[PDB]
Design a protein around this ligand. Sequence first.
Ligand code: HEM
Lengths: 110, 126, 126, 431, 352, 352
Amino acid sequence: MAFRKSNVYLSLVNSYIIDSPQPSSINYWWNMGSLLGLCLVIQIVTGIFMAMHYSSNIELAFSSVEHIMRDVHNGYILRYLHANGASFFFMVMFMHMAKGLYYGSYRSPR
Amino acid sequence: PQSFTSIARIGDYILKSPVLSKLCVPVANQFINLAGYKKLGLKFDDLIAEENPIMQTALRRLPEDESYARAYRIIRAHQTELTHHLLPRNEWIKAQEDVPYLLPYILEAEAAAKEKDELDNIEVSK
Amino acid sequence: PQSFTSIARIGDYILKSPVLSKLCVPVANQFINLAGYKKLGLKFDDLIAEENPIMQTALRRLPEDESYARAYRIIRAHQTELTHHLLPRNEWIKAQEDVPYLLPYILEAEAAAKEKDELDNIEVSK
Amino acid sequence: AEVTQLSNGIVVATEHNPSAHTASVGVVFGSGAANENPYNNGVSNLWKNIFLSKENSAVAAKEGLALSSNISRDFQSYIVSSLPGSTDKSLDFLNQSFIQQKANLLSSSNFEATKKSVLKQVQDFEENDHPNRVLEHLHSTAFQNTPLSLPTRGTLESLENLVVADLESFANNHFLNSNAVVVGTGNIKHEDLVNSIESKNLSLQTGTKPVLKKKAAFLGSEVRLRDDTLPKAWISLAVEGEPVNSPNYFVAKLAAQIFGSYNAFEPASRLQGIKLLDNIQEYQLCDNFNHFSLSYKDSGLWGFSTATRNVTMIDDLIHFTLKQWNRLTISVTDTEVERAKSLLKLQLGQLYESGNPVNDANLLGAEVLIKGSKLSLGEAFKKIDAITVKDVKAWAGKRLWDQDIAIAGTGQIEGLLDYMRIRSDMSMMRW
Amino acid sequence: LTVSARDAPTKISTLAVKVHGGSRYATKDGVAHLLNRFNFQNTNTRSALKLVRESELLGGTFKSTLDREYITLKATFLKDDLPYYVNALADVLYKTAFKPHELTESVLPAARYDYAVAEQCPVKSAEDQLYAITFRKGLGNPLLYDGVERVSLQDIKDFADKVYTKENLEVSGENVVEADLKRFVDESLLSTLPAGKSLVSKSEPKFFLGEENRVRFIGDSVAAIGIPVNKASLAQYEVLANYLTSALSELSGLISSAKLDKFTDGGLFTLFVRDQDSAVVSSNIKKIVADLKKGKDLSPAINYTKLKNAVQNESVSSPIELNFDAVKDFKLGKFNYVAVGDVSNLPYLDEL
Amino acid sequence: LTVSARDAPTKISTLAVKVHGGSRYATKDGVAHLLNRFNFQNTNTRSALKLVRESELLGGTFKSTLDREYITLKATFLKDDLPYYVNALADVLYKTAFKPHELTESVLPAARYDYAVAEQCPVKSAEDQLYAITFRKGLGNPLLYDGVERVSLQDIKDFADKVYTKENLEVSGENVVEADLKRFVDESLLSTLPAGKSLVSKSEPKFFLGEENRVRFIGDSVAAIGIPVNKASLAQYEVLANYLTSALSELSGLISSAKLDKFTDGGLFTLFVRDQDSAVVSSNIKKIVADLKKGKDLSPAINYTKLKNAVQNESVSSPIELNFDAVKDFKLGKFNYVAVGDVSNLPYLDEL
Ligand code: HEM
């Protein structure tokens, strides 16, 4: 058998991403789950790269966020990416939940 | 989740009454025409969600020609909705073609399961 | 990882030589007595790591009475080492009892695998 | 060794062999099932089976003649095996029964009985013979809407439209003197056959055959004939290979022989020198495969055809076969080529010089109909020995490496993935 | 050790060592099948893998074939490398390893596949039943191994020692120079094989007539008749087999198969009628037996069966050289009958 | 519709509706076995699950047994609920469902299990062979369904309409008040069954002698002799069966089993000699047939066989009441012979 099936971890990546049998007739509303995974990776990465500069004291919280917005190189990129990506995280989450409510993805197996 | 015996009971009561028939049957016919499953080549008993043991029982008990035809209608509806079109107007399921073919098998498996549960929970009169 | 053909080659050169036999065989007997696998009811051909295709081939080609005896010695060693004890000195493996029974099957499957590799990597003289 | 001569209307090709105890005289036409419509299909098959009729074969068997015919895509033959001293009787029977007095075989209640016979025979083919109809569907999709896709057996619904006028029209269009080669194998001399053709006036007709308006064009596609009540899952898979009289013809046959054929239950086919068996033997991916190189006058197929009961690991079988195909482009060794040279020489020597003069007659008629002369086996072995590793790599880079494949399968082929996932194996990412 | 060859100006040579060691001489049921499957496995010097991977580069293949009488070890190869294959067949006949792991991994799965293939075909089952009820312990041994008696590895070794002997085999090479072949058979291991007796018995093989057997089978239904023939009456049943196969006979549509098996002491005429439903097989074989008990004139089929026997006879190495000229009339006497399949609807022996 | 009952002062009654509808009256091969496995399935009124789950709480079970002649529908119960079981057997005979999903899910797997179990035993295989070569299309039908001919659902409905007829069955209650049983069988559906003809023929079953069959089988080896007997000669073969089973014979150590199957128009005396290796079976059955062709004095086994006949006869509802008094001597005449197993070492019929 193939190495993507015989390995310990590549069998997981294969059976979730590569050979995962999807029905042929699903539409672009089924893209929102992968989009939510993308939102989560965006949020976690921009969050770590701002936590390297943020200070959580009550005298330095707002001053440190403004330090990110002014002193940190491309820190405005990270802050606006984190904030508007959280808004987009919740947009795509409402679309995921609404397509679940619509197409009956909550019923007996699931 | 709603048992098919209950749907048959309520629908038979509506159909056996002369006032309820002439009041609600055209509403259901226009509802079925607006539902639009016939434009994809599906009869309604292809639409019933099969992921429950009563429906798995009825689908096991379906004869083979109906099974092969149902398989073709399901695959054809998947390909049709993949291409984001409908079937052409001569490939639509006609009204006289939309017969409940799975329904006696569903109702028989439902009566068997209800009788099995009722005998599982009996109380002998002593 | 070391091939049993290599061990047999070095060991046969040491055993056939009259100086090297009288020099190194008593040290090996003392090494085997200090290793103490016979104190758990084990021969050495049970100690070999069986998780390779050569050893799996040898254990498949091993006949049935040797297989059941080897299985009993392995389960007996597991129970003994579970109890953190030794076997009683009447039940220890004697030196005349520690005979290589799996060694010809190992060497035969090894020669077959080396021939298979040499034939997969030939260069025909043209 | 063989002599071909074009007499004043017709081409006589003999291959004398005085060690033989039989002699086969026949006529091979150059209109096989690629000269059909999709509507008269099977009319060459009906012509075969009314040449092999009971009423027609009793006349041969009273004289001591054996009738054998064959329908290919390019050619078709009508060969009459006899004893070596009885070949004037073979020419008299082939002249009277099939060429001149043709309207007696085509009577009604002989046509009807033979039509019922080949209807039963073609239906028995279509229900039971699974590797060969998978190769037939491979032709039908690899060459779809082109002459070379029509099944030589004939379909069940184009054999039911067929009447006696269709066989007569195929006869008057394709059984011509410019289209035929009269063939003699066994132990008859070339002067003897051409003298017996000059003696009795042997003329078929005078016309020229209809030119097909479209040449055969390979279209990468797949047909997926799944049938889950069958125990195995047969699948053929092929690229466009070389036609006959291509320069890369023997290189294509050699590269088909590099991966050879296989039978998982014959223990001497397990031990073969193919690197694909190191993959496909561990989980027993298949029961048998065989790589072919079908060559026709217009185009051809190069691929492999297999069968398996391991219907959940079809994708590993297809993936490992096609990753082995990429090795022809990138890293084919030398000993694979020398092994394929020796085995292709053995296969071609068993094929051409076997004991049967009927098969020699079919091969001879095909090769002198397409090329005009039969290539001898000494020159063919010289051509095989001329092939190097760079020739195989260049042919594989032309024909195999990242090219459109044609697939066909019946049985439990749900485990077979779709087209693009399989065609992504024809080229790897250089690893 | 009888060596023969027939030279030709071609490129492919086929060597064949024929031993009288088929199922007829089998001590246990199917030991000849197990030896035939045991033939080209590994030797004491060269392994079985090394044999295939050397002969593929040299350009020839091997094939061990089990008959009712012979075991034929055949090698097909390019002509210019004869001594490699003479020495290979010598090593196979003289020094086979006969390992228990070779029995339990290749030979017995191969024999199980062979028995499954022959078990799915009802005509082969009817032919084996017909052989076993015509001849009881001679030619009516089982052809393939099924496992109704345990055949151990020492039984296969003992059958090899009984059978592979120097007066029991005969080397025959098609498209081989006979002088080089007779030189290469010597200076080999065929000259070192034991000179045991020839197992060919020259007497008549003691048939039985009027026997009938019935087998229940799931699939097609066949009904088969079988007539044991002697040496003198071999030619008439040969022209009868090719007559009923041919288009001269009105019974040709009804008959699925009809063949005469030939040996050096007799033979067996077999006729098989095979269909899907049993009413067709019943009507067919009733008509065959009735129209054959009424006499037939086999004088049309003489020139046809000369050609058919020549076509068949150019393949084999030892022709029997039949007459076919003194055959005029046939009339069906006594015969053996087996019925495989839907066996409650097939006719019995007294109804034919 | 013959109602009989034998009252008793006990706690457990058994009811038995016996149809003349076993394998002997089967139109296809195995319809009787499939109807027998179709007996206590669901009806038009009461399901099969409701049948078991009511009859357990009332206190009795059901069992449908397929014989070579009858189909016995037995029902065992505490005494004071007889009309329930009378009406349940009535519902089973009159209105069974015969649903196709019941054929595929219950009846076919149960019959395949019965056939696998009786296939694993070579004694039942040889008994079926001995029947099928003594009488051909009558009692020599196959007992169980094996799938060699396609028995469909409609054929089971046709066979049940033929067999479940009012003049064909007999109601018999062990430990039942007979007047109450006759009152309860009337006012039920036994009286509304069709009054068809009885399938019991009153003629002799047209047996055959000297036949011999041979079945290969992996496992044990049995050899079986079998004699069809008539109505006047039933007691002699009864005392012979109990003589060879008994300790008076010197052949009881060799004989594995020996029994006479009695019918209303004849019987079959079947003797099986079974062992693991075929040489013991060969020596044993050669000694059996030799010392049976030499005469035996069956006079000592008479009082013993009166005892064993009363033992066997108290269970059944229909005694035949044999004589046992005029029986003096036995000498083996012609007989039918089957050999199952290592069939190339069990002897043939000539060697016995
Ligand atoms: C689950 C995904 C996440 C969501 C939905 C999320 C959401 C948010 C939101 C809405 C804000 C306020 C942004 C603003 O208005 O300025 C915020 C701020 C912040 N988040 Fe996250 N967050 C996520 C993940 C993370 C992670 C994992 C980290 C740490 C590693 C992180 C670190 C921060 C920090 C430091 C701030 C401070 C203010 C700023 O710089 O924006 N976030 N988060």
